[PDB]
Structures are given as structure tokens and as C-alpha cells.
Amino acid sequence: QDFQMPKGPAEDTYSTSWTNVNYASDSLESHNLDIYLPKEQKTAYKAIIIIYGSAWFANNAKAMASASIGAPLLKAGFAVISINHRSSMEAIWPAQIQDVKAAIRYVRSNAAKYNIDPSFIGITGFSSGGHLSAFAGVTNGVKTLTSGDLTVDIEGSLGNYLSTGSHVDAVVDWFGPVDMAHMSNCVAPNDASTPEAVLIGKKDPREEPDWVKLISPINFVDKDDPDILIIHGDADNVVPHCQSVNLKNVYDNAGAKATFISVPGGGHGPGCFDTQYFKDMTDFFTEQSTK
């Protein structure tokens, strides 16, 4: 009757909540995040960072990501930290990834204050958030990436915790676009009308091999990189299934560890956010948290 779309995780799934905390020591809402500790109270919680999907367009949707995936993470026993990032329309790449990295230095540096054990900081996201999650899980320890004559600052200088590591320990990628060389028909780059074109500054990806390489985490997968779980629906009409197939193939051929879960009849979210696959995520994140 009076209806309210779910805003953040349900109230009974957490004991403690800090909302609209800035992680960049500035005044931008694109640089805020929210933190939730489980109901089952403990001395410390290992942490999972989450990122909304939005074709990189949104800068204010951390409550959607919380509402979608936060409850199973809280019930599994992890602190859940949901972040904002800047819109592709207000800062082109690498801005989004510098935001994620800054958010990570924030969580790790201040873990104690939030009763976070920084022993483990996993990361997850859906769609473009899954992209950003994955881009972090293949760039632990990297401050710039260069392709041809193009150089991008991945770590950035955002905020006041630059000495703290900006690394993540495990990744769950929910149907993210991770191979932009093959987004069109799964064989080619898209044209300049698409969200990756805006991400690289309204250039035609078909003309920009270097930009396309440096927004595509599939290009940096290494044997030693943190393990990853990839979940994609085989009827996804927005980001094609082939993306996740490719990412898994690359993890497999580089000597790294990827699990790929394909969701039959799964849309771009629909059918994928079932108990079954939330469990795949929480089981994964638990095994990683303990190993």
C-alpha cells in the first residue's frame, strides 16, 4: 500500500550500522560508504566490500547493493561495506577504480574502529560493480597500468590512508563486463554509444585498443591473483554470458583459481539472486576467509 523498495539490508540482519561515511576525506557523496556488522555479535568480523551495478553511471546506489546481497553476507558472519563510486559522466576512467581502491584503504586502515578484522577483505559486485571488484582482484599492488602510449593511475592518491594496502583477498563477480574487446556479439568492441564508451571519455572502443585493454580485467589475470567466483545467467540480456566464460577460461589458462557458476534462465540479476547462489557466494567467501 505504502510501499518502499528495500533500502539497505533488513533491520534484523545487523547489530550495527554506520551510514554515509566518507572514505576520501572530502565532501562528495560519490565517496561515501555504509558499514554493517552482523546480528550474531562477535569481537571482530572479517569484511566483504560490495559494489552496485549501474553501467558505471550511478554515484549514489550503495543502498541498492546492500539490499540485494548484504543480508546473506551479514548472516554468513561478515561485516558488509557498501560503497559509492563516481559516475563515468563526472570522471572518466581510471576515476572509478581509484575510488574503489581508496575505499579499500579506508576500510583496512580503520578496521579496528568498526570491529573489522582486516585479516580478510573480500570484494564483490554485480554488473559494472562486478567489473570493479574484478579489476581490483587482478591489480593488487599496482599503481599504474600502461598500454601502448596510454598510462592510467589505478591506485590514485585519494584520501588520507595512502600507506595502507589497497588489496583484496577474494572476489565474487556477479555477471560483470570484464572483456570489452568482445562485448559486441561476444566478438568485437562496442561503438561509441555504449556505457564503456562513456567510461573511456566518449571515444569509440573500436578505435581504442589501449583504452579497451586497460578497462578490461581479463587482461591482467595472474597465477598468484586472489581466487575468484564468477556467477552469470545464461539468459543475461545486458552483459552477455560469454564474458564470464572468457574470464574463467583465462583464470584456467593462467594457473589461477576461478569457479564459474552459470544460472540457467538467469537474467541480469533475475534468477541469480536466489538462496542457492547466495550460498555459493557465502560458502566461497567463508572458505577463503579461513584458508
Author numbering: 2 to 292
Per the authors:
We demonstrated that BD-FAE removes feruloyl and acetyl groups from simple model substrates, acetyl groups from birchwood glucuronoxylan, and feruloyl groups from highly substituted AcFaXOS from corn fiber. The His-tag was not visible and the N-terminal tail showed weaker electron density than other residues of the protein, most likely due to its flexible protruding nature. Overall, the BD-FAE crystal structure adopted a typical α/β-hydrolase fold, which was consistent with the above mentioned BLASTp results. The active center contained the conserved catalytic triad of Ser128, Asp237 and His269 and the oxyanion hole was composed of NH-groups of Gly53 and Ser128.
The BD-FAE structure belonged to space group P43212 and contained one molecule in an asymmetric unit. The final model of BD-FAE was refined to 2.06 Å resolution and it contained the residues from Gln2 to Glu292. It mimicked the binding of an acetyl group to the catalytic triad. Looking at the surface model it can be seen that the active site was solvent exposed and formed a shallow furrow. The N-terminal tail (Gln2-Pro7) protruded out of the core protein and packed against an adjacent symmetry molecule in the crystal. Such crystal packing did not form a closed-ended dimer but an unusual fourfold spiral shaped polymer, in which the active sites pointed to the center of the spiral. The interaction area of sequential molecules within the polymer was determined using PISA server and revealed 1055 Å2, which was typical for strong intermolecular interactions. In crystals of BD-FAE, the protruding N-terminal tail packed as a β-strand against a small β-sheet on the surface of another molecule, leading to an unusual fourfold spiral shaped polymer.
